Design a protein around this ligand. Structure first.
Ligand SMILES: *[C@@H]1O[C@H](CO)[C@@H](O)[C@H](O)[C@H]1NC(C)=O
Ligand SMILES: *[C@@H]1O[C@H](CO)[C@@H](O)[C@H](O)[C@H]1NC(C)=O
Ligand SMILES: *[C@@H]1O[C@H](CO)[C@@H](O)[C@H](O)[C@H]1NC(C)=O
Ligand SMILES: *[C@@H]1O[C@H](CO)[C@@H](O)[C@H](O)[C@H]1NC(C)=O
Ligand SMILES: *[C@@H]1O[C@H](CO)[C@@H](O)[C@H](O)[C@H]1NC(C)=O
Lengths: 346, 346, 346, 346, 346
């Protein structure tokens, strides 16, 4: 079968950052192509062909005039016509970082997690093996419990246990994957900084519906220049665009806040991770020699393991048999169950 | 199952070189067919049928006139009508080289990599076999370490190790696949040279929206010639085409730069490859007898293997157990683990 | 699984001969149906229904008139209307020969190659068997090498090797499949000879965009004949058709040249084939008794096997272990490897 | 898996007889619906609604008038409107016989060929068994060869060989399947006789493109009858229909000729079939007791087996090992190979 | 896999009774929607909106008028508008009985045929077993043959032979399934009786294309009633509907004739059925105790068995090894083959 590399945070982010804006984009496209581009109040003299020319020129030129001349460069309205493509551009731009992280991390994370799942499976098999002599030691004794636990900790270190210790020690000082994850999310934030600014500058000031274009050719001059006509036009699609702009602004701002909160929780406020607590459940040191640097590789690997917690069978059951992450502090029940489950079968 | 032959770099290149321009092409087609081809300001007399004839003729002829006669050959505008097809032609042309390389390298690379993966699997199985006597030699000894490593290197040459040496020696002087890869990427660059030039010539000079056509027939002469009418027309689709042209120019220029940078890094600045370092991890000579020519077949086979790194199981684990590519310079732990993992099982 | 019979060159030919023209045909259809069939400058008096009748009649009749009567038969323009169907006809005609060859060779080539792949597999298994006693012979000896090779050639002839020799001898004088392949490619060339001629005769002379039709009925005579009106019409789709005609002409001419070059290389300039050299690698006579007639069945079976080179596992490896097609001229390493690989396993 | 019953000649016939006419029919439909039904030169007085009524009535009535009254029954043109449905009817009618033969022969031919393939497999297994003692007999002898072959023919008759003889004798006088095949192909020819005649009558009689209809009601009489107006109409789709009619005529005539030639070759000129020659290859009588009647069931079963030649494995190889259909006339090599292949394995 | 129950004759019937009329109905829909509903010769005064109102009213009312008043109920034409739905209704009604039979017989036929196929398989295995001692008896003897056959017939009764006898005896008097099949076919005929009559009534008398409707409202009265205008209208779709009606009539009448002939052949003229002759082949009584009532269950089960002939392997071969349905009357070959094929294998 296949192993998962997603994580609910990342998929929620990509959904709310790309899928929703794509839906709004297609909705705007449908609304705009269902209606007519522009509505121009052509004079009475205009024939139907001339009126069509006016309604086409005023939608291609799309530049508002002023009562008097008042300028040679008068305000334009091109953004009302260009937005429903800029939204697609923003959707693609904000979808790029997920693809980049996928390309840059697929093989590496696949290999690392493939090794880690087997390593944890063997670690919990070793835990099953090592809990067996504890009951015999306790009966031999029959603080007692404290000294028994201390001597067990001293004398239990297995070869694969040293393998785990060395692996954790080397990973703790190899922040490559944490670097990549932080880079991906910071890149998402920085890219989102662009459309937020653009839309806020578009929702804020450039919200105009009606203008008055000026047609230039004006035939019928009869060897003369001819009268330059001014035609008042109104755009029908500005309202939905101006509403979708605000919707997208709010959505992307909320996504930015969510990303920042998650990063702060993971790299500053977080103290205990998944794998560390899971190992401590069976009983290990978890000393600071591989800690005190929250910007650590295992720190994020914990999240992937938690998502893939059920990709490995054994661990699963061992987690739900007990609680409190003190599996080795009971005298009889929790360890006696494993004793009768495994020791006799051999 | 299937084995991959696509490098992330090549897939990124083909995406950004073909898929994006195809998307822009279909967007331009949608915009052009949603709108109306041309908008002509027909005179007042023109009936609807005559106006339709004018709006069709001026879009078929598509040749701008001048105030006076001033010529018999006056500037044309055929490109504004022809571009959204030349863009498809460029997309297909730039997709050609990938298909050519596929057709010319499928079987050869398939066979070569099928042989290489099995060879490396057997090589690492041999490494597992050969690490076992090293611990026994060390205990027999109990600079010591340096002389032990030297004698091990001298006396460890295995039959399949000689197979590997001969294979590498013969591949180092057979640059066929490197020739083909350089040819493919240089061909992509050369093909990109064409549309870049064309679009830059189109975005640069031939960018105008409004012209004035001259209708020729002019019936209603009543046994006479008739009046040759001049009709001012405006194209609605020039703006989007002129923007997509710039977008494509920038995209393809960036792709060209990426191609050149990758080639320079791979064939000039690169010093160490994947397979060489991987073999040196277990310990081999890696002498210059099969090196000093970066334009080498194994140089790219390294990249193909790296993409297919996880297609071979054993190697994977052996990479993450240790680091520093000095697996055999550790006295106990690294080789003691393998000794207990393999020697006792026999 | 399935076995291939595509031989890249044929697939390239059929692509460039059928698939591309089909794409151009559908592009022309899209352009023609997106536009209007004809644009006619109807007089002022014409109502909308009469103008529609004129624009329909002048596109159904589609025969250009002349200033005066000047004839009862005046030049026509039916090809501008008929081409985008003749192009489909040419595509189908050029696709026919591939289907014919498939129908006529499927079963026979399937059977022949199914026999040949197993036959070569057994041959290389025999080669593995026969290299084993050679090393013992050399050690017994310990020109020596030349006499050893000669005696080995004399005394090594195996039963299945006589099967090989008889099969090759009988195939060398049975040119049925070579006949069929030459017939297929010559038929493709001959069928291409038609569309090239037609399109060149169309791109060359029958190229004009505007004509003047003459409407016949002319009601409103009020018990009289009525005025025969002349209406100037312009076709919008001639330009794209005239460009696609040239594109197809160039493409099919290049395909013809490629076919001719490939045939000349294969049947005249070619001297060594795949199977012959592959057998000589292990060492056989390859005498002219089954050669000197390049128009030979085994000649194209060699290409078919080369395409299917990896459909037989063993051979593959045996090709990449050595080079120079002198596998049995090395004293030790090449045959010592096989000796340790096979002799001990028995 | 599945067994084939397609006999490529039949598939070619059905292709060129049904699929091509269906393609032409859909092409005609596309052309007719893309265009306008009829083009009528309505007078000036007509409004747009009256002009639409005229253009609809003259295409529903579709009956040409004459200058004077000249009749009450004047020539009609209904076939120009009805053909693109008669073509569909002809396509379905000519597809019927294939479906009829399928329904009437599926089970019977399935069972017969399922029995025959196993019978021939067993027959060639017996051939392998029986060639073994021939070498021993020859060595015992060591005309000699002729007497050995004669005595082998006399004494070799095996049980399943008598089974084969009885089966062939009973099939030779049971012409049911040959009857059915001849009936199918003669029925295809007879059904083709209809559309050939109809189209040749249509491609030769109906060539009118233009007529002059007479509208009947003519309101505005103001308590009077009103003027019966005559409107000249032109059909746009007659040209393509008239061309497709000729194309279909030629195609179906060529198919008829191909069918007749194939039947004449199979049932009159044919002398040797597949199964008879294949059995004679190993050596049997093939006497006229089951021959002299070319209209025989086994005659077409031979073609069916030839199409299914590779559906049985053993036979395949046994065909390519030798040639000349004289397998048992070779002294050593051909039979010695089989001896070493089979006799020792037991 | 799946077992077949379609009885291809019933597939032919359902095809020709439902699938063809559905094709004709969709063709009529395509014709009617490609054209316009009605063509009305509106007077000159009518504007375009009033003309549209007239062309819609006269097609909604669809009731022909008369020159004088002549009635308050004048002939209608609703059928010309209602037929292309009545055809769909008839198609569904005709498809109903097949669905009913399937729903009512699926499980029962599944169980019955599942039993019977294995039952016949066991019967033919028993026949293979029982032919073996016959050769021994014949050699013991060495009318002789007649006495041997009669003593075999008396002494060969096996337990499963009595199972066969009892099953046949009990089925012969259980005519439920024959009842169901006859009911299905007679119901198909009776349901066909409706559309045949309706269409023959529609094709016969209700055939007129042109009528003259009378518009009622007639505004512009200026405080007065207004002039009741009469508008001549013509339907364009009557011709194709009238042709399709005749086509359907002929098709369904021919289907009725086929059904009647098949039923008469099956239940009156039929004498020997598949299973009876198949069992008589190996030799059984087939006495009239389970016969003389052609309206019998096994009578129809024979057809399903014949369709499912090849669904049981053994039977197949045993049918074609011999002929004449006298397998046991041959002395040596037919029985010696089975003897040497089975007796030695035990
Ligand atoms: C209108 O038509 C007359 C002749 O028909 C021509 O002289 C005049 O220039 C036309 N006016 C315009 C504005 O084209
Ligand atoms: C105008 O109409 C009259 C008759 O109605 C015709 O003789 C004349 O040719 C028409 N003029 C043109 C320019 O077609
Ligand atoms: C013109 O209209 C009148 C009635 O308005 C009609 O009688 C006459 O036939 C029409 N012209 C022709 C050529 O039919
Ligand atoms: C045309 O209109 C006038 C009044 O508007 C009316 O009297 C006359 O009957 C109308 N024509 C017909 C054919 O009814
Ligand atoms: C025509 O217009 C007048 C006023 O302009 C109005 O009173 C009258 O009702 C109109 N005609 C009809 C038929 O309504």
């Amino acid at each position: 079968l296949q192993l998962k590399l997603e994580l609910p945070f990342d998929r929620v982010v990509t959904i709310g950052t790309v899928l929703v804006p794509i839906l709004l984009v297609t909705l705007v496209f449908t609304k705009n192509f269902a209606e007519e581009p522009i509505y121009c109040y052509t004079p009475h003299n205009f024939t139907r062909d001339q009126a069509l020319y006016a309604r086409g020129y005023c939608w291609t030129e799309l530049r508002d005039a002023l009562p008097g001349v008042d300028a040679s460069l008068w305000p334009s309205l091109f953004e009302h016509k260009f937005l429903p493509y800029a939204l697609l551009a923003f959707a693609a731009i904000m979808y790029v970082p997920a693809l980049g992280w996928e390309f840059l991390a697929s093989t590496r994370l696949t290999s690392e997690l493939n090794f880690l799942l087997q390593e944890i499976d063997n670690c919990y098999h070793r835990a099953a093996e090592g809990r067996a002599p504890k009951i015999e030691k306790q009966i031999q004794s029959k603080e007692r419990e404290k000294r028994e636990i201390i001597e067990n900790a001293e004398k239990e270190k297995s070869p694969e246990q040293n393998l785990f210790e060395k692996y954790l020690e080397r990973r703790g000082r190899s922040n490559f994957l944490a670097k990549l994850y932080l880079a991906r999310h910071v890149l998402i934030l920085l890219l989102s900084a662009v459309p937020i600014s653009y839309l806020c500058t578009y929702y804020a000031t450039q919200k105009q519906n009606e203008f008055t274009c000026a047609l230039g050719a004006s035939p019928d001059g009869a060897a003369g220049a001819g009268p330059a006509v001014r035609v008042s036009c109104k755009l029908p699609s500005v309202q939905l665009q101006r509403i979708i702009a605000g919707v997208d602004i709010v959505l992307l701002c909320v996504m930015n806040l969510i990303i920042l909160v998650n990063l702060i929780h993971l790299f500053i406020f977080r103290k205990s991770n998944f794998i560390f607590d899971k190992l401590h459940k069976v009983g290990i040191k978890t000393r600071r020699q591989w800690r005190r640097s929250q910007f650590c590789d295992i720190n994020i690997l914990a999240m992937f393991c938690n998502e893939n917690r059920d990709h490995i069978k054994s661990l699963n059951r061992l987690d739900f048999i007990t609680n409190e992450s003190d599996l080795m502090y009971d005298n009889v029940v929790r360890q006696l169950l494993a004793a009768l489950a495994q020791s006799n079968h051999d």
